Structures are given as structure tokens and as C-alpha cells.
Paper text:
k-Turns are widespread RNA architectural elements that mediate tertiary interactions. The standard k-turn is formed in duplex RNA where a short bulge is followed by G·A and A·G basepairs, and folds to generate a kink with an included angle of 50° between the axes of the two helical arms. We describe a double-kink-turn motif comprising two inverted k-turns that forms a tight horse-shoe structure that can assemble into a variety of shapes by coaxial association of helical ends. Using X-ray crystallography we show that these assemble with two (dumbell), three (triangle) and four units (square), with or without bound protein, within the crystal lattice.
We have solved new crystal structures for two further forms of the two-k-turn unit in which the 3b,3n sequences of the Kt-7 k-turns were changed either to U·U or to GC. Both sequences confer the N3 conformation, but neither is well folded in the presence of metal ions alone. Three two-k-turn units bound to six L7Ae proteins formed a triangular assembly in the lattice with three-fold rotational symmetry. For each two-k-turn unit the two AfL7Ae molecules are related by two fold rotational symmetry, so that three proteins lie on one side of the triangular assembly, three on the other. The overall conformation of the triangular association is similar to that based on Kt-7, with the same coaxial end-to-end interactions between C helices, but the structures are not identical. The Kt-7 3bU,3nU-based structure has a larger pore through the center of the triangle (seen clearly in the space-filling representations in Fig. S1†), the radius of which is increased from 7.5 to 14 Å. Clearly the formation of these trimolecular assemblies amplifies the conformational effect, revealing relatively subtle structural differences resulting from the change in 3b,3n sequence despite the k-turns remaining in the N3 conformation in both cases. This may be due to the influence of the altered 3b,3n sequence or the binding of the L7Ae proteins, or a combination of the two.
Numbering used by the authors:
A (entry chain G), B (entry chain H): 1 to 117
Amino acid sequence: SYVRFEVPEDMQNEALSLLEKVRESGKVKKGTNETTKAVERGLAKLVYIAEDVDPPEIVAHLPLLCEEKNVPYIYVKSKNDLGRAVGIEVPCASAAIINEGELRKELGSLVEKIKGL
Amino acid sequence: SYVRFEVPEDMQNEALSLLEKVRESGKVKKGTNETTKAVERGLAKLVYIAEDVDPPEIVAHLPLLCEEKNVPYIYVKSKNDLGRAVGIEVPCASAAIINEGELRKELGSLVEKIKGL
RNA sequence: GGCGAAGAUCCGGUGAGCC
RNA sequence: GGCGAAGAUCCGGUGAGCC
């Protein structure tokens, strides 16, 4: 298939909880273009990438480059569900964490749960 | 009426007739943005401004900003007449000549006819 | 109520085509 | 037939509002 990572529901939902309570403290990028070029700036602390993208063309590129710049990234759920997580009113194929707010020291834990594959 | 130098009709028609036969003879920029950059870059030797343009604004800036950069300019009644004269298929509020093609002597005499009203 | 991060609006550049 | 130098298309920035 498109993205080559598999991930249980519980930690995907951990991604939506972290992304749901990051906005009040840090910064987040919404949408695949802002994610791709915000990370291409080198400013990603954790990337959101989803497989329910149609056509797969939409994001079939960013996990690989997020492995190059060695920025964390996680395959998560439905575009809609993350859309609610980042708190915009529309589906979202890809997101990013740009500033860690007052929470900071969980994002590392999540990156190493990503390193499991 | 932003006509700050009232130009005769016969002189308008001679200017548009001259402007008719200089589009593979010389080079002309079409449209208020291309005319205004023609004056700003500094490569316009004679710009045409139509006076029935509405809103006036759309080209109202170009005679004064044109005079300051000391590029001559001449006034024309209908935007339509100018637009069809400069062989494009739509009305045109403002035009410019940036290269005089082979017509150095006629445009020279006409420029001196402008500087005088 | 419809459209919208599968990118709304706006801006810059480009300059004669697009349906 | 319609739209178009009162800027078609295309490219750029911006990132959440527009009817």
C-alpha cells in the first residue's frame, strides 16, 4: 500500500490526544503543504501522516523525506479524525508539530514508540 | 475629468494610427500593470492613457507617476479604440511603447507635439 | 445551510489567452 | 457561443476563512 508503517489504534489515538492538547501551548501546522514545507524548513518536531489519502499521490512522499531530515513522523487514522485533533473544520491528510508548548517531554516518548518498526 | 492636458481629436487619431502599425515593427506593453512597470523600470518612451476609464484610479496614477519619471504621455478618448489599436482583442485602459521599431522620426515629432499643451 | 488544509481568502510575479 | 490587459492562464508566498 501507500505508507509502509502499521500502528495500533491506541497509539494512533495517543497521537490525536497529543495533537489535540498541543495547540494551546505550542504551534502546529495543518495540511500537507504546510507540513511538507514546514518540515522542509527543518522545523518539524513530530509529523502526522495518514494513509486514507485519496489519491495516494497526496502524501505518498513525505514519510521518506521525514526519514531523511530525521524528523519524527507517525501514520495516524482518518484524515477527518486528525482534522478534529488539530481542531480545524475539514479533513487533514498531514500535520506537524512546530513548537513544543508547555508539555515538551512527551514528544520524545512518542517518537521512540514510533521507532518500534 | 482627470484630463490635465486636453488633447485634440485629430492628434489622438494620428497617435492611434501610428500605434496600429508598430507591433511587429516595434514593441509595446499592454495593460496598466505592464505600462506602469514600463514606466517604472524606465524603458517606456511614450505611453498612452485612456481617459474614459472607470474607475479613474485604474490608470489615474499613471499620468503623474509617468510625468515624474519624465516619460512623455498622451491622452486618448476611448479605452476600446486603444485596445483594438494595440492589436489585442479586448478594451485597454493604458498602453506603452518601449521600442520605437523603425518609426523614430514620426514618434519624435509627435512627442514634441505632446509637450506643448 | 453550501464551499474550504484534497488549500478559503488575500498578495507577489507573469503577460494573452481560457472555457 | 461565453470569459479576458478593468489581467486569460501559469508560477510564487500566506494558512482559515469564503458565500
